Design a protein around this ligand. Structure first.
Ligand SMILES: [Zn+2]
Lengths: 146, 177, 156, 94, 82
RNA sequence: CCUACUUCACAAAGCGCCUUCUAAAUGAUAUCAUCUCAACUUAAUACCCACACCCAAGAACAGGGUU
């Protein structure tokens, strides 16, 4: 990566470029997810995968730089949102209720004062439906609404 | 076997204090374990009339963890019987009032809706912190495993755990971050 | 076909590796030989059999009582060998059949003590507004068996 | 005597002393009573299992509402085990 | 090294088939508590009902009495067994 | 609540008096921007609590006082 060193002087210094591991097990895949057999096999828990696509101040990287699938870019974008809120990315700050699997922004959701009748009940969203097609090792699928 | 009648009978129906750490746990998934041990449904000697419930000590119930936006959406509604006395309060506000009441209401809803329910609630001991009284610490027998596996964060991965995971993609040599 | 270790890479259950059938059939031969030595040298104490007498399974030791809901058409005092024993346990071993045990292995005896009737047992039907009210009183026959002995034999 | 325990028939006081004397007759050391399991120690309904070890191998262990009760009862379990009069003994052959 | 359950706490379970494959022999002697796993032996109506409630961890209701109709329905010579 | 006034007069009253406490910045997806169902940062006390006779206590019971 390159940095913008300044003090009045402003210069740009290419510093310490990484590289991807030499042997993708699925070469001639397209996305770096697709190349490494990870099309449905990651969640918000595993932050070693999420952290590689994140700006050091917590934001996402654009799809052109990462070269992701469109699908997997929305999935990682969502999982990174769901992992900032569970406090799994503490060092991606710019400078207390425990959550996990939060689809919406916590300061934006009106409380359910009238949960409906049994045939029209307002449910609470848990997790994201972008992560439907993950490998469920249970028989029941993910309940996305509690 | 080969006990006398009275100490065998004492041994079988004796009740056991369980500890249950509720840090980073969901309250309903604590409430299920707690409810089973409060009714005595984890004993093969169980019967409804035989009164064989246990004690459940749940600690760290300030440190519960709702899944999804249940902190901001889930509503606890009560009514003082007076007119205009209907009080709906979200899970966050009620957790700032009393850091026991979410786990307490969860368990209290799980238990069978009968008259044994409040004797069962007087067997459950909720504490919001690491601090448990000494008279209760001298009763505990087994600590139950937490039902949710707390996912570790990026600070808590060791170096070899980070190194074992591959870098997936080559960044461009000139990109700013 | 490598997947890096994520949450959902592997299944969450730990893999078990079942032992190979050569050393496992040899190991079974060792165990059956041990238990057969316990049956030969009389190491066991008292037994309990699960016996499929009549239509149901009775868990049974020696010196006890079973109340059966039909007349067996035997005289009081007659001894009986209960076939269809399907579990036999001691303190340190059990033996369970697929689904029944060998007749040469286990022998369960039982005498008939008494042949009673049940207490009178009401059968009432009633539908409202229809004048529908029947009443019957039924007593089923019953016999009591006293399990005398569970003898076990070294035939493994 | 079917369904009756030994010390429902042969009543004794002080089973611990009796167990001590019997273990002297087999030329075994005096047993250490040694608290194996417990629950509800600070309540009106405790449960104890006192064990009785001889050269750090237990011979019997019994429950009780107090520690003394459980120790006496473990002494009784050991005495049933020395005399063959256990709950699991071979039944009477008639 | 396979164990179908952690043979640690109740009995050491050792399953077997016979050569005919007709009976399953289970062998299961008891697991004694180790000596190392042991500790040495250590050496008015309102307030009375609250005191009993708090003592036996029950509610207050079973300490109030009951009337004669319920005291006389009770079977004082109930059937015993075993 | 009764000092006055008024109905009245060992007192009760009112017409009389007293008291009444979502919005910013920053900022990614989408290198600009962008309020962000993106992340980060920022904006209940009071009250109450131990015979008999008279009573400002009172339907009875209860309560207060009886030095
Ligand atoms: Zn792809």
């Amino acid at each position: 990566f390159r940095e913008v060193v300044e003090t009045t002087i402003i210069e740009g210094r290419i510093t310490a470029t990484p590289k991807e591991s030499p042997n993708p097990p699925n070469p001639s895949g397209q996305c770096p997810i697709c190349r490494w057999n990870l099309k449905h096999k990651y969640n918000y828990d595993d932050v070693l995968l999420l952290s590689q696509f994140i700006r050091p101040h917590g934001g996402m990287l654009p799809r052109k730089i990462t070269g992701l699938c469109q699908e997997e870019h929305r999935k990682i974008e969502e999982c990174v949102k769901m992992a900032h809120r569970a406090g799994l990315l503490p060092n991606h700050r710019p400078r207390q209720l425990n959550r996990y699997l939060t689809r919406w922004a916590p300061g934006s959701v009106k409380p359910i004062y009238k949960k409906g009748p049994r045939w029209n009940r307002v449910r609470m969203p848990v997790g994201s439906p972008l992560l439907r097609d993950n490998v469920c090792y249970s028989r029941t699928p993910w309940k996305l609404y509690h | 076997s080969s006990f006398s009648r009275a100490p065998q009978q004492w041994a079988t129906f004796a009740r056991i204090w369980y500890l249950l750490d509720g840090k980073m746990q969901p309250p309903g998934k604590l409430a299920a374990m707690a409810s089973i041990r409060l009714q005595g449904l984890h004993k093969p000697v169980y019967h409804a009339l035989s009164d064989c419930g246990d004690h459940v000590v749940i600690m760290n119930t300030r440190h519960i963890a709702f899944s999804g936006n249940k902190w901001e959406q889930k509503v606890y509604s009560s009514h003082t019987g007076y007119p205009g006395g209907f009080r709906q309060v979200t899970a966050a506000q009620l957790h700032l009032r009393d850091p026991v009441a979410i786990v307490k209401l969860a368990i209290y809803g799980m238990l069978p809706k009968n008259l044994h329910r409040r004797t069962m609630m007087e067997r459950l001991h909720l504490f919001p912190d690491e601090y448990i009284p000494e008279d209760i610490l001298k009763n505990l027998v087994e600590e139950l495993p937490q039902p949710r596996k707390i996912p570790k964060r990026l600070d808590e991965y060791t170096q070899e755990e980070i190194d074992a995971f591959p870098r997936l993609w080559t960044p461009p040599e000139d990109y700013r971050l | 076909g490598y997947v890096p270790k994520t949450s959902l890479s592997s299944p969450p259950w730990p893999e078990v590796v079942l032992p190979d059938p050569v050393e496992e059939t040899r190991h079974h031969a060792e165990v059956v030989k041990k238990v057969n030595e316990m049956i030969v040298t009389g190491q066991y104490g008292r037994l309990f059999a699960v016996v499929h007498f009549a239509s149901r399974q009775w868990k049974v030791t020696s010196e006890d009582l079973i109340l059966i809901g039909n007349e067996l058409d035997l005289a009081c005092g007659e001894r009986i060998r209960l076939e269809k024993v399907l579990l036999v346990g001691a303190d340190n071993f059990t033996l369970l059949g697929k689904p029944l045990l060998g007749k040469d292995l286990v022998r369960v005896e039982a005498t008939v003590i008494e042949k009673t009737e049940s207490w009178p047992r009401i059968i009432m039907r009633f539908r409202k507004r229809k004048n529908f009210k029947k009443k019957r009183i039924v007593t089923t026959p019953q016999t009591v068996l006293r399990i005398n002995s569970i003898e076990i034999a070294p035939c493994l | 005597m079917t369904g009756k325990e030994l010390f429902e028939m042969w009543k004794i006081i002080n089973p611990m002393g009796l167990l001590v004397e019997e273990l002297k007759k087999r030329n075994v050391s005096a047993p250490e009573s040694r608290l194996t399991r417990q629950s509800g120690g600070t309540t009106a309904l405790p449960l104890y299992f006192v064990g009785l070890y001889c050269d750090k191998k237990l011979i019997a262990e019994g429950p009780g509402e107090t520690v003394l009760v459980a120790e006496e009862e473990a002494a009784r379990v050991a005495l049933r085990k020395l005399y063959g009069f256990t709950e699991n003994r071979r039944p009477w052959n008639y | 090294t396979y164990s179908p359950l952690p043979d640690d706490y109740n009995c050491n379970v050792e399953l077997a088939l016979t050569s005919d494959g007709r009976t399953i022999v289970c062998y299961h002697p008891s697991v004694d508590i180790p000596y190392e796993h042991t500790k040495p032996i250590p050496r008015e109506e309102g307030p009375m009902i609250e005191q009993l409630s708090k003592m036996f961890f029950t509610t207050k209701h079973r300490w109030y009495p009951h009337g004669r109709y319920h005291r006389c329905r009770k079977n004082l010579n109930p059937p015993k067994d075993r």
